[PDB]
Write a protein that binds this ligand. Sequence first.
Ligand SMILES: COc1ccc(/C(C)=C/C(=O)O)cc1
Ligand SMILES: [Zn+2]
Length: 258
Amino acid sequence: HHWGYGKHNGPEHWHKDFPIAKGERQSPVDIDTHTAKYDPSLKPLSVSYDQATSLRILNNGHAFNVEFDDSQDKAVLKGGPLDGTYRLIQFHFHWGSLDGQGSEHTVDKKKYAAELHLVHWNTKYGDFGKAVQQPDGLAVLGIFLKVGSAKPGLQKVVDVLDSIKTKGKSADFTNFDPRGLLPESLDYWTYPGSLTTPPLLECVTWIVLKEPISVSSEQVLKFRKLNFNGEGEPEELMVDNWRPAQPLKNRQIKASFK
Ligand SMILES: COc1ccc(/C(C)=C/C(=O)O)cc1
Ligand SMILES: [Zn+2]
């Protein structure tokens, strides 16, 4: 497949190769804060990242992934809407060419400059490939980015980007602490949805934090210097790698906070 974010291979085209793009539980969505329902039944959300073991950072020609050792329970997400234990496998971002766009989820139709996705899979399914074939296989923690003050926890990501400028490049990325990417509050919205890139599988419990993190102009500008293209190919800046909001259809968004 040769999908991307351009006029000729972007989100409006994806359904031809991935028909589930027009499915019943696609992501992202607009979070209407006035129709989301406070759910007192939600258990506390547990983000347990103290033993996280990062391995590598990779430019895959769509975004960049920071990958983790997910062979044991070293960084896991529990509680909230989740049953069982979800292992952190990777995180990546979606971002814009301008500060007023870039996020995939929106909040009362507001776009943020970027959105961080921490991707976790349900350990009952044994491996990530099996998990994505299950309706409760993944839990993605989504965190909005707005431009303001710098995020210190993000700088080590920023400073390795020059070494993975183009599609296919990877670099060592050990000893990175993903706790440094979290806002103060873990208040969240949650709903059942999908991957937001092909194959768009409907396997995700989305947990989207209410509180954005702030990153600096310089930090987001360095995201925008990445390339979609491979080395030696005509330069196409890696910007606007976000899917827009999809129809909510038969879904309720629940909130953890009143
Ligand atoms: C089956 O291959 C996969 C490709 C992408 C993904 C993810 C995690 C996509 C996304 O972030 O939307 C999962 C599996
Ligand atoms: Zn994503």
